[PDB]
Amino acid sequence: KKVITVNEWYTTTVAATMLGRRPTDEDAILVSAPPNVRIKAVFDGHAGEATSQYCAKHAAKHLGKLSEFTFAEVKKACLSLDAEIIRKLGPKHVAGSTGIIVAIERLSAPVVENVVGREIVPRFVPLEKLIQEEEEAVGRYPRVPDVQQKTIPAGSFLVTAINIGDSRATLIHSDGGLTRLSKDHKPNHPTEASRIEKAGGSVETFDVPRVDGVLALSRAFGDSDFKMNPNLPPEEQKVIAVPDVRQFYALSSDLLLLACDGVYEPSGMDWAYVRDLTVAEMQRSKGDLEEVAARVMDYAYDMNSQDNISVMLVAFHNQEVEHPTAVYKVV
Template identity: 30%
Template sequence: MGQGLPKAVTSVAVKRVGGTAFRVGFAEMNGWRPSMEDAHVIYAQDTWGFFGVFDGHGGDQCSGFIARRIHEELAQSGMPDDDEAVIALALRLDKEFLDSNQPSGSTGTFVIVKAPTTPGGNYHLRVGNIGDSRVLLGRADGSIYPGPGTDSGLTTDHKPDLPSERQRIERTGGNVQEVMGVARVNGDLAVSRAFGDAQHKTTGGPKPEDHPVCAAPELMEFECGPTDFLMLVCDGISEGSFPNEAVVRLAAEKLKAEGPVDPAQAAIAVCHEAIKCGSKDNLSCMVVLLGGGEVPGEGVEFVPGPFEAPENAAFRKAYAAMAEHAGMSLPQALEKQGAYFR
């Protein structure tokens, strides 16, 4: 994955959500890529919540479609009851997208959180993963909960050379090839589970799980305490020299800063650090605090980065697109940028 822009777009689109049971901060940054292909879901209710990050590839059509449809399904039908319901929902939405004949694909990682029924009780986590974004669980002291997944995460990256994934890929008519040191499905896709990616779902079957690439989530359950916090990060956060333990430690430091606790500031800091650590991908980070209340700051905010390549059309377009994610036009963003760096 090479640099798509002459300079990284380091502006951040921020979202903050407070409520009865959760406080959420979300930050997304375009980075070096020509366009932003990530999407997300924050669906916080009084006793439960659904939080997800969807990392698109080959365009933003799939990630945006899946995020929108999940939100609609949650609003209509409420929390899925069990693993079978979650899997059925993911596969049904994948079929909807495939039937729309749109290009692109998307990974997805999410957590369904149930608040405790008694004060001070534990939170129940149903963690789902499709692809290589990650869910991390942090503790108030800055340590990471030693999860069973990749790099102590709660999720395992679905890479084509993971033995269990390779077995399915080859059993269903696909193959795993190494291209420039990266294992790829059919020499193309660097993840083995994803929404969309129709070209990798033509062999195998008849079940949707029985294709070289499938959208069936891997699901696990955990319990955690009210002082713990969740992080959902796209693979852009992880692709440089920024291990999960360091991600959690940085977020915890920002959560301990003086003044009202703002999970969005922790998410912003993680995106900026990932760029410093060498990431060349889009960046998304969500921090979920367990326990209700208000989140200080604007509900939607644009934090401008330097406008360093104004003569480059691709840079201008990417800069404008990030501003639009926060509800601002390019002229408004540049006005704020000028004031921000004055």
């Protein structure tokens, strides 16, 4: 219902959030922050809103100083922020928060890269493959493409997806296809379970697999009580603030959609269904971004999601926006 629309640089960004069936809304959205670099994010907090709101307000500060968006550089940036969060909000019982962050850069000239679909192979296992392995453990998603050399046209955007937790980012192509930019960090998955056990933790399933039978996520900012091993660095604790870092290219005709777990909780509503809703609403509404975000949010609520629901959509332009504006309206 209540949507913010920012028209600036080479993008049109719309964002909205709702309490849903929860007493408070712990979701926070970084709508935009800065040469030729934009940073946007959706932070999903739990057990409090102090950490997610801190992240929204300060994540750009750390990521914004980076000269390259490599795993190593991004990793030190996230741990730096996490330490700052724990220091300022703790030291004990610090609320936690997921974080799906994107660093968007525009190409003013074409570039040649090796790619697997939209994922740029760094100069390796494509994320789509890893996601499909987890899903098997279907049919709604195409088989993983073979690597190929591609000339990414000027006007295209480089998108680095920095993920921590289970919020998600998706690129919807003009032809309807989609690229999954993130893979949820769950305690029961191999890499995560290994770290947890090494740090002296357990992974027990009640309603859902939980770390020490408490936390549903294996990675998150905050959550100070699960990072007190100190015989191990912060990056090897039960729960860590180390992100997965992947890069993809987006064409000016794409749509980038970031959403929290609340949108995908109904248990039917997967990446594919969300794409179908977006595609259908873009058609029916005649391309009104604000309405499509509002409709995907209502669908999730109507399908009985019991979580806060937040979505951010980004459309890209071939030319700089002439008259930038930031507008807040309803519907």
